[PDB]
């Protein structure tokens, strides 16, 4: 409440003065304007904070609030004399002096929408779901076994090896060079996808793509570090809507280029690289905040953590997060290889990865909107609902693991979208039973530890299944063993329930 809360209630009160008649109650409005203006005169603004006080470049702030309070006097001396439009003219003069004097020392007045403008243009990647048909296509001439057993295990090991340092580096450098590194990593992914020659180029591509998917936690923490804590809810809602709209618009653009527009995959990756250059240009113009999380102590965190370690509905959901996240990402990293195996058509327009991606994003947004409304008590209904969701997941993975006829691949696509629903129904709810119990530093620590052990379990299962020197199984038997794993999870949660 240094300058920003007083400034926003001043703007709201000026809107109240603008849209009201019957001027008996505009005197309270003008004196609240005066109180909010005089409270922010000694505010010491953050862009002026680096400068020394009693400086000749500081008195412009006090002179601007001086003429501001003077025009508040000129407005209020006419509001008591029965005049109702002269107060509006003085409010217009107050608006002109607001635009002239004060807004130079204010930071920026589109910091919501520009982040929305970063939530959209940094998510337009129309060749996201079309990476795997670009590999198996006639351009790069990769086989199915080499992309199944060799390329994506490097993605798993690299995702562990960049989940270890880059979270601390994300919380360290105040989140702007980390998003810049994420944009440069996307640029590296599509440059190694365009200029690829052999398997090792694609392995380095999966290293940088693991950097991109590991830097996904940076955006919400950047919102929390930029936006004041009493405005975080609405701005976070607009930003999540912007991210979902960007992903859905990216997938719809991929369908409109590949299917309808009849655009080749090289030109598609060229357009994707162009949108990534726009993303890098927009990421260069991001303001670096100051208040980080783990750098702006440890015994206090342990004392606040130990009061809820033996609390129920926190350890079971953590183990569910680990197990179902490992299984879910191991299904997502191979569903495209399975779809290219079942439907190996040479037609580029016959590939419908973008339509399934758009339907997945839409159903995930619907089941995430239908997740906070779940007012089901968790004393007895916990393990039964989790057992039903894991049984549905095992049924859908077993449904994907037997389809070998080509013309039923349509019957695969939306079915996997249902699997894309079956996790996204319980993404906020697993948040709601974890994040609503501890402090925000402890919340970030608990979710980081859960994601870290989820990546450990996923790396162990990748080392067992898709080892180039161990099993080396094809992706059909991989989905069969994944269906066995989800069946074992369903048996465990059914034995826990009843």
């Amino acid at each position: 409440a240094d300058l920003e809360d007083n400034w926003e209630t001043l703007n709201d009160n000026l809107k109240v003065i603008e849209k009201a008649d019957n001027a008996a109650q505009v005197k309270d409005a003008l004196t609240k304007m005066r109180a909010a203006a005089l409270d922010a005169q000694k505010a010491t603004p953050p862009k002026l904070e680096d400068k020394s006080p009693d400086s000749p470049e500081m008195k412009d702030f006090r002179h601007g609030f001086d003429i501001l309070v003077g025009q508040i006097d000129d407005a209020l001396k006419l509001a008591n004399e029965g005049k109702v439009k002269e107060a509006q003219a003085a409010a217009e003069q107050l608006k002109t002096t607001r635009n002239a004097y004060i807004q130079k020392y204010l930071s920026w007045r589109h910091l919501v929408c520009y982040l929305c403008f970063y939530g959209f243009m940094a998510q337009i990647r129309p060749g996201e779901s079309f990476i795997t048909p670009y590999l198996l296509g006639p351009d790069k001439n990769f086989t199915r076994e080499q992309v199944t057993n060799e390329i994506t295990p490097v993605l798993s090991y690299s995702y562990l090896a960049v989940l270890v340092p880059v979270f601390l580096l994300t919380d360290y450098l105040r989140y702007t060079p980390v998003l810049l590194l994420q944009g440069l990593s996307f640029v590296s992914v599509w440059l190694l996808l365009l200029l690829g020659h052999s398997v090792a180029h694609m392995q380095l591509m999966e290293l940088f793509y693991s950097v991109t998917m590991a830097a996904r936690i940076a955006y919400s923490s950047y919102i929390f570090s930029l936006v004041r804590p009493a405005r975080y809810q609405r701005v976070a809602g607009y930003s999540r809507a912007a991210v979902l709209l960007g992903v859905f618009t990216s997938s719809v653009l991929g369908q409109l280029l590949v299917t309808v527009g009849r655009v080749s995959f090289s030109t598609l990756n060229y357009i994707s690289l162009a949108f990534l250059t726009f993303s890098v240009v927009l990421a260069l113009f991001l303001k670096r905040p100051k208040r980080s999380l783990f750098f702006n102590v440890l015994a206090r965190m342990l004392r606040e953590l130990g009061d809820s370690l033996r609390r129920p509905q926190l350890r079971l959901w953590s183990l569910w997060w680990v197990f179902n996240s490992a299984g879910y990402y191991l299904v997502v990293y191979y569903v495209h290889i399975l779809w290219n195996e079942v439907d190996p058509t040479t037609n580029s327009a016959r590939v419908y990865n973008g339509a399934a991606d758009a339907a997945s994003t839409l159903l995930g947004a619907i089941t995430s909107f239908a997740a906070g409304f779940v007012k089901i008590r968790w004393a007895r209904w916990s393990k039964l609902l989790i057992a039903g969701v894991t049984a549905t997941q095992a049924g859908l993975v077993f449904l994907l693991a037997h389809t070998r006829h080509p013309s039923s691949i349509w019957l695969c696509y939306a079915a996997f979208v249902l699997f894309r629903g079956s996790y996204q129904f319980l993404v906020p709810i697993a948040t709601f039973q974890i994040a609503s119990s501890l402090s925000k530093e402890l919340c970030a620590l608990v979710f980081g530890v859960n994601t870290f052990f989820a990546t450990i379990v996923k790396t162990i299962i990748t080392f067992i299944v898709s080892d180039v020197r161990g099993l080396g199984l094809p992706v059909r038997k991989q989905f069969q063993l994944y269906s066995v794993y989800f069946l074992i999870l369903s048996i465990i949660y059914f034995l826990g329930a009843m």
Partner: antibody
Amino acid sequence: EVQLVESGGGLVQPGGSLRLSCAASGFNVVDFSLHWVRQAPGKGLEWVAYISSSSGSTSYADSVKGRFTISADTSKNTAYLQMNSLRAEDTAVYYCARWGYWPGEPWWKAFDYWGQGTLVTVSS
Amino acid sequence: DIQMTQSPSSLSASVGDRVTITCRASQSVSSAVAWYQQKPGKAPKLLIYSASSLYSGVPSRFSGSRSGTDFTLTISSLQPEDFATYYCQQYLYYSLVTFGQGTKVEIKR
């Protein structure tokens, strides 16, 4: 030194009239605005009215609105407070105080040099 | 229009006792309030202005503190001259002068 003085106070009748003089020795009334503060005997301080001789934006209290009036002359360097149809509640001591203009430091300074204050009473 | 409450309306202390007088506003009035000292019979005098600054003429044993809408006067060493009535007055505009009730300090006996 600069100071204030009040004159013209005494005893009146309910429904009568009385004019009060507030003379400022030293400073002028165009550089500092003048205020009137009521103090009932036994009660606390309360505000009546003001005048700014530069422009003129005389606003009153809710209990004296439309009943009292104020007029300041800068040639005689004084302020007159005229009261007609006085009620019985107005038996009090009236202080005439100085207060500065926005902008600057003399606005943030409060009523610094109060006057001696006159005594008015309304009785039948 | 707005109210300006003042809770310790009857204090009592001896020579050498730190006393505190609180004053609560109704709206979010900024750092512009006044503390006044009125001897019995005489005129009030400016003691504290702008809720933190000391007026030139009164000693250093008078102070003040703003905490939101709570203005607090603190007297460290109670001089026997300082037995008077202390008033709280928010000043924000020419026509929004609302005084407090008044705190009459007494001698501890």
